[PDB]
Structures are given as structure tokens and as C-alpha cells.
Amino acid sequence: STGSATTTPIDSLDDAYITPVQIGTPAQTLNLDFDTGSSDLWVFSSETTASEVDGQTIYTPSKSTTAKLLSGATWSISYGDGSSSSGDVYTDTVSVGGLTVTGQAVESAKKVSSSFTEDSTIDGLLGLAFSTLNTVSPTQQKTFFDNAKASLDSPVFTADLGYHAPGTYNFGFIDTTAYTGSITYTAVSTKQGFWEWTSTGYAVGSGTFKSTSIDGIADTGTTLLYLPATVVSAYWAQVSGAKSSSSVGGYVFPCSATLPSFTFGVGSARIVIPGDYIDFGPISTGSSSCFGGIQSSAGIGINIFGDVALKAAFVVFNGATTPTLGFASK
Ligand SMILES: Cc1cc(CNCCS(C)(=O)=O)ccc1Br
């Protein structure tokens, strides 16, 4: 089997991407944030505290003939940005882009943090990191990908995120029309439950490439590119007037600037992030200070190749017995 679904930016800045997902019978379509940095499929629901719902579509298990309470199971997750949600668990039929899993754990939110209530465009998350991070207790649950894997034509999914445009998530096959050149594969460590890999270095604009190992994770559910402070300082030093602002919470730059590109290494290959991808626009409406898309990881404990980086590539998440990542230009 295979599946293929379009993923669409939630706003003009590409802060996140939403993908329609069918849950239940008859289908209830929710727009979920596919997150390769977490392992819970959770949704706004008929159980979510009413004051915490503001425009999201909800899953109502009582309307699904295939929904079963997963008796006694609860979940609770906290994300690197301070956000959280928690609740109870149903099993139900979940389909993505024509690929169906029966008995998927669908984590129904009772509580969500402010950051979720205030995003009417995101009806929940679909985690695609390793199932070892799943937060369901007392019986940990599998991701949609792990449940689908055995049925797929190839144990892979691919992320093809657009810059200010829709893109695609495919499951079970590699669309050889979707990229240019060849795919470079690189080793993955699953020790922290992430798609963790080691970049071979970086360049800023037309500068020389610096060969240096940068461990990090491929994370579709993080907007920006978070890298070591040394790397990030070297980038923003090439932008007149850029500075780190503790008041704003990262590097800002004059909105009048033209940003340089940023290249990262994948083995002997190179992925180039155009400068425009690193512009996240005014810090507040009408400001002439703009927020940067490359930020320091210093206050995180991990480097994160988020959407700024991933949208510059066709990315293969190879879930074979020995997992690997692949990157191609596009
Ligand atoms: C939309 C959304 C997604 C996620 C999942 N990714 C979080 C990545 S980080 C580096 O910020 O911890 C959290 C919160 C919101 Br709000």
C-alpha cells in the first residue's frame, strides 16, 4: 500500500503545515500537523475543555462506529516551546492520503495549552518520530507510520514541504519526479527517539564550506532551523544590523536586508536554503525589525533541522530495520 497527501502552510510565513487526516467511520477529517519530532497522534475532540477550543475542528468518538475507548490509557505531552496537551485514548481507523490503519491510537485532548487554542488552523498533531517517545500510559502506543509500515510497499515516508506553497507527504514510496539529482542517505541514531543525524558542515552565502559535525534532528513540527551559537553568529554576522535580542527572543534583522543563503552538508552533498526562506517577517505588525529563521539551539540541548531547512529538500525518512535519512535537492 501507499498514501499521498498534500500539506499546506497555516499562514503566509510557513509557521507550520497542516495535512488532512480521516479519522473514524464515517470519516471525520481533521487537519493535523505532521511532526517528525514527536510520537503522539492527538486531536482536539468533543472532550476538550470548551474554553480551550477556538475554531478547531474536533473529533467526536461517539459519532464513529469504529471508535473504541482504550480503557485506562491516558497521555500527557509537553513540547520544547512550553506547550502541552493531555487526555485519554481511543482506537479508531485513520487514513492519510488513501493509506488506512485500523486500530490506531487517537489521543483525545481534554486539555491543551494556550498556544494550541490560539491556533484555529491546527486540529492536532500526528507524530512521526519513533514510537519509543509515545506518551500513552500504561501501554505505550505506536505511531501511524509504525502501524502502517508492514503494509507499505517500502518502509518509508517522505516530506516535501513547500516554501510559501503546498507540498506533499508520501508513505510507502519515493516519488522520483519530486527531486533533482540523487538522494544522499545518512545514518540515523534512534537513541533519543528522534530522526537524529549528523550534518557534515555549513556555508554562509557564497562563503567557503566549513567541514564540521553537527548532530541534530529532522523535525517537521519545528518552524525554524536551530543550530549551535557559533554557526548562527557566523550567519547573522553577514547581515548588516542583525543582532540577537533577548527582549524578542532571538536574532532579528532589518526588514530592508537581503539575506544570504545557508548551506548544510549531507555527507558529500549540500542542501542550499535560499535567503528568502530565512525571513520570518516583522516581529510585530508594522515593525521594521524582522525575525530570523536561523536561531541558536544553545537553550534547547539539541540542534533542530526544522521546516526552514527541510523545505529546501526532498527528505526521505527510511524506517527500515536500520533507519536512515535521505536528502535531495528539488
Ligand atoms: C504547532 C505546534 C507544534 C509543536 C510540536 N513541535 C514543537 C517543536 S519545539 C522545538 O518548539 O519544541 C508544538 C507546539 C505547537 Br503550537
UniProtKB/Swiss-Prot annotation:
Protein name, as recorded: Endothiapepsin
Domain (Peptidase A1) ranges: 17-328
UniProt family annotation: Belongs to the peptidase A1 family.
Enzyme class: hydrolase
GO molecular function: aspartic-type endopeptidase activity
Active site, per annotation: 35, 199
Reactions catalysed, as given in the entry: Hydrolysis of proteins with specificity similar to that of pepsin A, prefers hydrophobic residues at P1 and P1', but does not cleave 14-Ala-|-Leu-15 in the B chain of insulin or Z-Glu-Tyr. Clots milk
Species name: Cryphonectria parasitica (Chestnut blight fungus)
EC number, as in UniProt: 3.4.23.22
Keywords: Aspartyl protease, Disulfide bond, Hydrolase, Protease, Signal, Zymogen
GO annotation terms (biological process): proteolysis
Disulfide bonds: 255-290
